[PDB]
Amino acid sequence: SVYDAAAQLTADVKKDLRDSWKVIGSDKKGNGVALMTTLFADNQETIGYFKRLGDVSQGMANDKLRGHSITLMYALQNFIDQLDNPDDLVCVVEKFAVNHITRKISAAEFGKINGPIKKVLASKNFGDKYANAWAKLVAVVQAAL
């Protein structure tokens, strides 16, 4: 239940999401591409889904990948801005869920993003505490897949 999942976002979780986002969200192009490349590097079996982006091993040099990455960061920006209103958070989450449901992405495979997120956060000096906070936001999306 996406609604029960959203209720898991307590005051402490929301604060950690915001604090960490202020830092990582300041460089959407850099951190966005880092997130994606890390995903492809640690989970090669997911690369097939991104056929449209071309050669993802080119990283920042790949225009399609860069465009994709930046846009992805704005989806997270959307989520963060909706934290005060669970009804609005839910409707945007379900909107992006659809984009993945059509791509045949399951809740389990969507969860493979948690590894990359922890690594990107770690490189910015944010530990498990912040990684666990984001796992909870990711869980809201998973509940809608």
Add this chain to the structure above:
Amino acid sequence: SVYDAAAQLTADVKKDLRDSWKVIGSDKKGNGVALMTTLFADNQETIGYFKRLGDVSQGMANDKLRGHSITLMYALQNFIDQLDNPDDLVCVVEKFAVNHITRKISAAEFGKINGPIKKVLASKNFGDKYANAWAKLVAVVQAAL
């Protein structure tokens, strides 16, 4: 090319885009829904394209329409943030262009958004100069369609 259209946006145009977005963009849910509803009111022929959103006459009450509207405003947020780097603006514009190319939206049909934009701008007292500034940003997307 799309780059040509992007690279043309002058300092004065970027200024009007940013000043108007500061206001309109501060209420993404309210202004995004008004933009969509205005499009359906003045161009009823486009209603058919949004069948996934259900009953669009429901306005704010329609969760799917609300989620779509908020998300559309973040695509604009994305554009606004990439203004000083044509290379990044282009790759994100092309990304969203694919989203519409897939729905068989022509450059002409996409330009229908200009009327609604003008009205939303006017409701906040932003005149023709600002509407023309936005028509120029829309043209960047049209160059990709």
